């Protein structure tokens, strides 16, 4: 008869119970305690300025209408029963399109304690907005936020709190990171207030701090451009009389720089300003352009002032490596130290 | 105190008929609208639409929902929206739209003692607007959103903006990667269909495209190839392999640029400004190689005239190219 006793308690709890009213309506503020477990921090899209995250969302509140007496002190509830009681209407302010998983059944869980406390957990995938400043690309770092609160209840009716200290209230799994171009450094947890045309609301916020990995651009863009510039400055050591050889050399290093620049620019998203890579590529292009102008000047002065042409080539064999090394020192000291 | 609220609400919903509008058969019901724009993104030239996320609020008075004895505004669970009458509002140019439903459906119902109902929704919609790209990328666009009632007429329902020109907020906080919002406008009017008149509200934005991306990604490569085509004029005419290789590689690079831009850009089958600029650059490099065609054709009979043609080409080509740029930018900026 234990099953029948339990059924009676279940069929008795919801007698005279209205799920359209929050607990303590008109008497006190409903306090909701919230914590988040991140199972996977999914891919970050710089083109769309958005990111994906998979979480377990845990909420806890008190409802005096749901007290009971029985042999047990904790009740696990089927998801059909969890839709008959009042639950908070939490939503993400900066969410774009989120999914609540229900395979093979709704991924919801509702536990009731004897004193009337309700624990409500769910599994969600959230695609949120992370606006980015790409002036330092590809040496940039971003703070991607995640904000949530009540859609309908003002701060005079429902308030949110973290279950523990805010640092320890959001926990990321050890294998959570699913990022191929970023490095997750940490997170900061805060809480604020927003005001809209309908009232004032409590907002709970978490910021994930990301730093971009640069090895791919170093091995794919920077090294080929540096080698192309070095190749273009190698032309200074060919003898002056090989005019077609040095002309083909210079014009093909110019075509190589153009090809590399277009390939690199294909990866970049459509941003209005100029990134750090735009300046690096523009400087390498100007360096190979000036090396071909230098050879055009030597060829112009050849056969009339060979002494000046030789002095120009001897000074260029020093100035070009020096100027390029200085440019690299400035470039990699201005951006690597931010 | 909570039981009295439960009694009052169940009193209101007892005998309530969802199929009848407020003041059914009498004066039309007036509905006020508010829009709080949260973000605008994905302005697509290929799809000819844009994506908008917003908070959409509606205010109206229903005497059947008036209550007394409680000095409070009742924010109810959003599933009570299925038990009440709500306007049949829709967007005329919407291709795809949905209401967010995490963690629950993003809907709000609020009641007031006098019977005023506030009904809020969080909506992401893809709206279609025609784009005239003859001046692309130096073009301005005017994209709108149309709000109308599907079934009722002006004898039943009326629309107005709640707050005048302040009914729509959040535009000043929008940042678009490629555009910049110049102005927004609110229009109220009626549309006379075959089934009768229909109230309509319209919200429009005017967008002005940014140029920095195209300057650093499109125009500069063509300019640089044009300048590189002038290197031939400073090479000795007996260096046939160097000048031929330079001419044909600049032709191949310009052709590759034009073909791949045609492959990546949206298929817009009429003449734009970018096609005119790319074709003009292609003509300039065509004439630069044709000048060497003349010089090679005449350098034996008249070597002095061919040298004078090369010297004058060193001046005419940069000057005519700067004159072309000056006319192009004056005619398009």
């Amino acid at each position, epitope marked *: 008869d234990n099953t029948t006793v339990f059924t009676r308690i279940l069929d008795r709890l919801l007698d005279g119970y209205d799920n359209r009213l929050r607990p303590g309506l008109g008497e006190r503020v409903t306090e909701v305690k919230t914590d988040i477990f991140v199972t996977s921090f999914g891919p970050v899209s710089d083109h769309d300025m958005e990111y994906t995250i998979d979480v377990f969302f845990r909420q806890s509140w008190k409802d005096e209408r749901l007290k009971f007496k029985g042999p047990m002190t904790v009740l696990r509830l089927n998801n059909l029963m969890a839709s008959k009681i009042w639950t908070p209407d939490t939503f993400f302010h900066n969410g774009k399109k989120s999914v609540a998983h229900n395979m093979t059944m709704p991924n919801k869980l509702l536990r009731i304690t004897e004193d009337g406390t309700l624990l409500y957990t769910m599994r969600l995938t959230v695609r949120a907005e992370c606006p980015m400043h790409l002036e330092d690309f590809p040496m940039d770092a971003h703070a991607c936020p995640l904000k949530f609160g009540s859609y309908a209840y003002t701060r005079a009716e429902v308030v949110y709190e973290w279950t523990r200290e805010p640092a320890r209230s959001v926990v990321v799994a050890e294998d959570g990171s699913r990022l191929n171009q970023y490095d997750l450094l940490g997170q900061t947890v*805060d809480s*604020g*207030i*927003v005001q809209s045309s309908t009232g004032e609301y409590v907002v709970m916020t978490t910021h994930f*701090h990301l730093k971009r990995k640069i090895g791919y651009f170093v091995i794919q863009t920077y090294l080929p451009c540096i080698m192309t510039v070095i190749l273009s400055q190698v032309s200074f050591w060919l003898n002056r009389e090989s005019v077609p050889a040095r002309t083909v050399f210079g014009v093909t290093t110019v075509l190589t720089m153009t090809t590399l620049s277009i390939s690199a620019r294909n990866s970049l998203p459509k941003v209005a300003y100029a990134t750090a890579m735009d300046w690096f590529i523009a400087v390498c292009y100007a360096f190979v352009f000036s090396a071909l102008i230098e050879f055009a000047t030597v060829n112009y002065f050849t056969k009339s002032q060979p002494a000046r042409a030789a002095k120009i080539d001897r000074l260029s064999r020093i100035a070009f490596p020096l100027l390029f090394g200085i440019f690299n020192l400035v470039y990699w000291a201005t951006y690597l130290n931010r | 105190n909570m039981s009295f609220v439960k009694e009052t609400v169940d009193k209101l919903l007892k005998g309530y008929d969802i199929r009848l509008r407020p003041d059914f058969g009498g004066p039309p019901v007036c509905v006020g609208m508010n829009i709080d724009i949260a973000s605008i993104d994905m302005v697509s030239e290929v799809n000819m639409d844009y994506t908008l996320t917003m908070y959409f609020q509606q205010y109206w008075r229903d005497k059947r929902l008036a209550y007394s004895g409680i000095p409070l505004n009742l924010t109810l669970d959003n599933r009570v929206a299925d038990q009440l009458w709500v306007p049949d509002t829709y967007f005329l140019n919407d291709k795809k739209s949905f209401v967010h439903g995490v963690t629950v459906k993003n809907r709000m119902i609020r009641l007031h003692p006098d019977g005023t109902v506030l009904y809020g929704l969080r909506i992401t919609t893809t709206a279609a607007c025609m784009m005239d790209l003859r001046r692309y990328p130096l073009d301005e666009q005017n994209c709108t959103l149309e709000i109308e009632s599907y079934g009722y007429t002006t004898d039943d329902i009326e629309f107005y903006w709640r707050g005048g020109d302040k009914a729509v907020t959040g535009v000043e*906080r929008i*940042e678009l990667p490629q555009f910049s919002i110049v102005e927004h406008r609110l229009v109220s009017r009626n549309v006379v269909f075959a089934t009768g008149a229909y109230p309509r509200l319209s919200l429009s934005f005017r967008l002005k495209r940014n140029i920095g991306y195209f300057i650093l990604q499109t125009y500069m490569p063509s300019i640089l190839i044009t300048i590189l085509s002038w290197v031939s004029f400073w090479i000795n005419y007996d260096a046939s392999a160097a000048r031929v290789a330079l001419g044909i590689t600049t032709v191949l690079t310009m052709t590759t640029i034009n073909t791949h831009l045609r492959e990546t850009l949206p298929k817009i089958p009429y003449v734009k400004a970018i096609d005119m600029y790319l074709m003009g650059c292609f003509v300039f490099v065509f004439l630069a190689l044709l000048e060497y065609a003349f010089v090679n054709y005449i350098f034996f009979s008249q070597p002095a005239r061919a040298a004078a043609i090369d010297r004058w080409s060193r001046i005419v080509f940069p000057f005519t190219f700067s004159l072309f740029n000056l006319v192009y930018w004056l005619y398009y900026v």
Partner: nanobody
Amino acid sequence: QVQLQESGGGLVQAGGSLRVSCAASGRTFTTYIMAWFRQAPGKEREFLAAMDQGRIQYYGDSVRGRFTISRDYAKNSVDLQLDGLRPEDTAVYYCAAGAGFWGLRTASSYHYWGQGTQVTVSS
């Protein structure tokens, strides 16, 4: 160049309203977090309030309920309403803008800083 010019300040008689403003120039800070800081004479630099692009308001645990922050996005500015001022509130108030990397409540995460504005409370 980018300059954050601050106005307001002065002296008040241990109470009353005091709206300190902050106008930005040379760069639009619509997508940035704009905050306010306070520096008592020789003491630590303290976070007061901050507002991000979504109009979310953050406050320090000492000034909550007394100082109100706001932003005029059209004019690209930010204001702070000081109410119920006390002698302990006499300090130099600063205006800052930043992306909030590694924390918006830490002063070491703001790229641009104002020149300050003295607020004196007399009792």
